[PDB]
Design a protein around this nucleic acid. Structure first.
Ligand code: SF4
Length: 1118
DNA sequence: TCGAATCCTGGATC
DNA sequence: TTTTTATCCAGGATTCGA
């Protein structure tokens, strides 16, 4: 006991000293106060017996920047269930044995959705156990749970208990759920004295957020030449930081040759960047002064970029060299999770947001690229290798650089991150840094728990996962999965609204549309616009012009016309389908309940049936073979966990070991025993959805959708008011309006993110509310919608690109496009409607709409209303100027999500899948693709378009023929060199074989083992001519030898090229030019020639030849 | 002797 | 206590059978 008590109370007292040093005082005496809740953490406090008690600390900040704490007790608890009539016996035992280890037990009725026939109104009983402290709960939990499983397998005083629930919610989550306490609101707090718990209440009459002091910093480090730094060998060079927009810098005079002068730096006029600099003689004075000043300002938030990895451990180690205890002086320490934390201030790292919520591509997550995109300017570089000489020769250029990593970090954190995470906190019972670090599945689950609690619903336990489950015929299932969505590119080449194209349109489709024009328009006016057709005056005329143009299309169906390009898509399709079908994780059933439900009367209508496709993957062996495979294991013996241990029999293994060994044994047996190792089989299934079941989930999604659209509207209102304030030019009014705009947009983005999270959660294996069926039906209905949206277009025109949620298509110029209706309504005098939308939304409304939606009218009545609903609608983007798609070089393949698209201004509108997003495999390919995409815009006929695109191919092919004979001498290297890197150590690869490995060995044979020892080896390398016919993984040369010393260069080349007979060793002679030509000739062949061949023009590039099958088909034409 | 299929690592995917 | 991983692509080597 004593060690535990003194350990926890001592660390508590130290934390109290630490946060008292930063000015957080515990609320000392009875009183009443208000503030903004900035953080909370669990801690123990003593009771009136001086026993331990679990509690939570709340940290508050006031308007004036004063700060205080409160501590708050709450007894945790969990539920258990029992057999018929057992609760008096069970409670008698449980109270007697654990006396003084549990606080309270009671019987409570609960709503439980798995109980048969429960819609009649029944609800079941549970016993609640509650404990003085969490450790006593953990001990009783571990004594209890062994008794449960055997009882479930059977389907006496302890053994009768049957089940347990909610035993694993985190205690701070439990309290924050239960008392409705959420960060980022103002609160009134009252302390009466120890006779009463402290009382907290939210107040809604306050809005504007307070202004926390936040700090951002960066560090710069000495290193040995061609070495990474290490904390023993290398001193600090610079540490630079911002607080309250003021900058500060310190730099080590051990390497800096003279004292630095202060200066002002400014990326843009809005970025004030004043700095102050101290010069002191050594690194110990640097670190001491840094702590001495940081202890002055006492910030609340600290931010760094990937700072858990590089920035903190470095200074922690350098602090250790001088014996400075940062964990006492600052109070930062590394948690069991592996990440830095402190009891009193929050460490926010921008990268976890950039990785999760920015939608930047992998290439762009460099700090300087992220700054360039988000802030609109580039911080200019200095290489770390240069710092030592710059600090010798001209240090103030390095000082000028050292601002660029700080200021961009601070402004990125403030503008994008800071308004957002605090907004997302307001709706979820989690801490800001937990909400940043945790994944969106957990974020959703912590939300749904709140609704399940307030509806008094007992949670389900986590979905424990089975292994080696058997198909009914006996086959061992290796996976299950629903058939996903299907993406296909139907067509290839160039479309431009400036040049004609050939259309052949079915003559019945324009009659089928013309028969229903009034239907197509009435629905779009009444339902979408919400103006009754009574109130529109010109409605008869627009119908006449529609009918007459459609008839004119009927008269001449096959024609040449300039194209219209349109993008059609469905706004948040998956939420809308969930709402429309009433899909809920629990709402699925099978007849085993409907056989026993008192609502299953003749003429009941609560059953909705739907279909989905299941894709079994399973091994070929039969059940009777599997039983023999099992029984053969019942005499096998297995190794211990470590060489000293005894051998284990197969029943002494863990279940993952058992499954792994059975899978290995059966796969090995099957490879001989059967012709094919495993099988896949698509099979489609019906599933009932019970329509009457409790609505809480779908109501939650509905609420989030509507709140999102409210906040969108208020955002636009405030943005307009901000524009007015900007034109008025009152700085206080501009500030107020901008702060409103920032808050409202931040809430809009939070709501969007949470709403999108609701679909993906049910994918999370193990998750509390998990089902496969709903994730099947929600896909297969989307594939139905997007198939029928294709059929009707293929008759009118031609689709070009399907998608997960939209279509790109081309339509004839003579199509009706857009119209305006004239209306008497005060709110809406003129209204614009687009025909392509109203053409489809009727079809969707007719086919998909649901006629079985029911709702409970009055809880005591058992009366339900029957209703119909539909939220599924199409919308339209465009038209556009040009659209371009590549083609597969292999005949049978259709690509996915490659194309480009251009606005009518010629500013690029989209570009997807192409390497020009990435670093590219080679700079030559990246630049080529970039130049050709722009070049396609030029010219005015297909022959002219390809004729003037090919002049970009020739300008490069002249290079690879002329061996860079014009290009500056070393500038060849930065064009031709790959800069790839090895992923892992060769000691971590082991048996693997690759180019990067081969060149790593080639580097090792020059450098020795000095570098291959290091992880993540960087490579710069080329392909060498002289080893003619050597297999490609043997070909590489590392660049650096061409820049090393002359005799070394000569000797190692003579070693590598297998010849002494080449006189002049230059990359121009040495490269396998034809390899790079054979690569450019394979990029060009998917963009400029094969697409052109698919549109019946001749090959525009004589220097490149078609693939065999295409040439065969083309000659077969002749 | 040649064609195609499997499996591999590697980056990338929102 | 817990994290996106399956899917897709791209280049590459090795095996199998007419
Ligand atoms: S779907 Fe209707 S009839 Fe079937 S179990 Fe549910 S409530 Fe009863």
């Amino acid at each position: 006991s004593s060690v535990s008590a003194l350990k926890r109370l001592e660390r508590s007292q130290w934390t109290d000293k630490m946060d008292l040093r930063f000015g957080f005082e515990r609320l000392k005496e009875p009183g009443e106060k208000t503030g903004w809740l900035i953080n909370m953490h669990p801690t123990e406090i003593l009771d009136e017996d001086k026993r331990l008690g679990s509690a939570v600390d709340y940290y508050f900040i006031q308007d004036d920047g004063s700060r205080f704490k409160v501590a708050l007790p709450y007894k945790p608890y969990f539920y258990i269930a029992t057999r018929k009539g057992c609760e008096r016996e069970v409670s008698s035992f449980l109270s007697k044995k654990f006396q003084g280890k549990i606080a309270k037990v009671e019987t409570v009725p609960k709503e439980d959705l798995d109980l048969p026939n429960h819609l009649v109104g029944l609800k079941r009983n549970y016993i609640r156990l509650s404990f003085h402290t969490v450790e006593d709960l953990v001990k009783v939990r571990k004594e209890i749970s062994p008794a449960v499983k055997k009882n479930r397998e059977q389907d006496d005083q302890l053994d009768n208990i049957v089940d347990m629930r909610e035993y694993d919610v985190p205690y701070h989550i439990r309290l924050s759920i239960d008392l409705k306490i959420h960060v980022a609101h103002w609160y009134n707090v009252r302390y009466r004295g120890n006779a009463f718990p402290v009382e907290i209440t939210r107040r809604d009459d306050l809005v504007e957020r307070p202004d926390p002091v936040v700090l951002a910093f960066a560090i710069a480090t000495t290193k040995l030449p061609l070495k990474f730094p290490d904390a023993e060998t290398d001193q600090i060079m610079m540490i630079s930081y911002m607080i309250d927009g003021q900058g500060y810098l310190i730099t080590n005079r051990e390497i800096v040759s003279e004292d630095i002068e202060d200066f002002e730096f400014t990326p843009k006029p809005e970025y004030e960047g004043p700095f102050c600099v101290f010069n002191e003689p050594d690194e110990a004075h640097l670190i001491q002064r840094w702590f001495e000043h940081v202890q002055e300002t006492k910030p609340t938030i600290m931010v760094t970029y990937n700072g858990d990895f590089f920035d903190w451990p470095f200074v922690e180690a350098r602090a250790a060299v001088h014996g400075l205890s940062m964990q006492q002086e600052i109070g930062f320490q590394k948690d069991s999770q592996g990440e830095y934390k402190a009891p009193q201030c929050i460490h926010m790292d921008c990268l976890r947001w950039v990785k999760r919520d920015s939608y930047l591509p992998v290439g762009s997550h460099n700090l300087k690229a992220a700054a360039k995109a988000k802030l609109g300017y580039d911080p200019v570089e200095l290489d770390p290798e240069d710092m030592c000489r710059m600090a010798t020769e001209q240090p103030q250029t390095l000082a000028t650089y050292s601002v660029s990593d700080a200021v961009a970090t601070y402004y990125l954190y403030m503008k994008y991150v800071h308004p957002f995470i605090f907004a997302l906190c307001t709706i979820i019972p989690m801490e800001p840094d937990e909400v940043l670090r945790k994944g969106s599945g957990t974020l959703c689950e912590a939300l749904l728990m709140v609704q399940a609690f307030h509806a008094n619903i007992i949670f389900p336990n986590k979905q424990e996962q089975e292994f080696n489950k058997l198909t009914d015929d006996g086959h061992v299932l290796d996976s299950e999965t629903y058939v996903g969505g299907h993406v296909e590119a139907l067509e290839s080449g160039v479309f431009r609204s400036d040049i004609p194209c050939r259309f052949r349109m079915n003559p019945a489709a324009f009659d089928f549309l013309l028969q229903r024009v009034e239907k197509t328009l009435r629905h779009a006016l009444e339902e979408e616009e919400k103006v009754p057709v009574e109130q529109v005056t010109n409605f008869e005329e627009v119908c006449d012009e529609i009918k007459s143009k459609l008839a004119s299309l009927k008269d001449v169906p096959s024609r040449i016309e300039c194209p219209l390009i349109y993008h059609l898509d469905v706004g948040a399709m998956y939420p809308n389908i969930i709402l429309t079908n009433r899909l809920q994780p629990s709402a699925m059933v099978d007849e085993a309940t409907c056989a026993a439900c008192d609502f299953n009367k003749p003429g009941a209508n609560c059953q909705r049936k739907m279909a989905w496709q299941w894709r079994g993957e399973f091994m070929p062996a039969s059940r009777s073979e599997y039983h023999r495979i099992q029984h053969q294991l019942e005499s096998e013996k297995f190794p211990p966990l470590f060489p000293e241990g005894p051998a284990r029999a197969f029943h002494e293994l863990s279940r993952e070991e058992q499954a792994k060994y059975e899978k290995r044994r059966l796969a090995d047996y099957c490879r001989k025993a059967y012709k094919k190792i495993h099988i896949t089989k698509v099979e489609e299934r019906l599933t009932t959805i019970c329509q009457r079941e409790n609505s809480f989930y779908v109501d939650t999604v509905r609420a989030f959708r509507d709140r999102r659209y409210e906040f969108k509207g208020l955002h636009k209102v405030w943005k307009k008011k901000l524009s007015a304030a900007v034109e008025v030019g009152d700085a206080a009014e501009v500030k107020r309006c901008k702060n409103m705009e920032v808050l409202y947009d931040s809430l809009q983005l939070a709501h969007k993110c949470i709403l999108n999270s609701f679909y993906g959660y049910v994918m999370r294996k193990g998750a509390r509310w998990y089902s496969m069926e709903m994730a099947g039906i929600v896909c297969f209905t989307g594939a139905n919608i997007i198939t029928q949206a294709r059929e009707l277009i293929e008759q009118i025109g031609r689709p070009l690109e399907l998608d997960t949620d939209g279509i790109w298509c081309v339509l004839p110029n003579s199509f009706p496009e857009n119209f305006v209706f004239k209306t008497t309504n005060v709110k809406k005098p003129k209204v614009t409607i687009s025909y392509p939308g109203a053409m489809l939304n009727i079809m969707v409304k007719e086919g998909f709409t649901n006629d079985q939606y029911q709702e409970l009218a009055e809880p005591s009545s058992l009366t339900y209303v029957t209703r119909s609903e539909n939220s599924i609608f199409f919308e339209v983007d465009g038209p556009y100027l040009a659209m371009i798609l590549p083609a597969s070089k292999e005949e049978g393949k259709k690509l996915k999500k490659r194309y480009a698209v251009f606005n009518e201004d010629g500013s690029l509108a989209e570009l997807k899948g192409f390497e020009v997003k990435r670093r590219g495999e080679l700079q030559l390919i990246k630049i080529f693709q970039s130049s050709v995409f722009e070049a396609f815009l030029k010219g005015s006929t297909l022959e002219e378009v390809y004729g003037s695109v090919a002049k970009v191919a020739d300008y490069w092919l002249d290079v690879l023929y002329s061996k860079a004979a014009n290009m500056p001498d070393s500038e060849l290297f930065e064009l031709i060199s790959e800069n790839r890197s090895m992923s892992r150590k060769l000691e971590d690869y082991g048996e693997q074989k690759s180019t990067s490995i081969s060149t790593a060995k080639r580097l090792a044979e020059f450098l020795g083992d000095q570098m291959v020892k290091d992880a993540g080896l960087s490579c710069r390398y080329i392909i060498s001519r002289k080893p003619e016919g050597s297999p490609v993984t043997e070909r590489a040369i590392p660049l650096a030898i061409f820049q090393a010393e002359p005799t070394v260069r000569k000797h190692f080349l003579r070693k590598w090229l297998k010849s002494s007979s080449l006189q002049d060793f230059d990359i121009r002679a040495i490269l396998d030019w034809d390899y790079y030509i054979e690569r450019l000739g394979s990029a060009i062949q998917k963009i400029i020639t094969i697409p052109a061949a698919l549109q019946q023009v001749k090959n525009p590039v004589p220097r490149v030849k078609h693939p065999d099958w295409l040439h065969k088909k083309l000659l077969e034409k002749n």
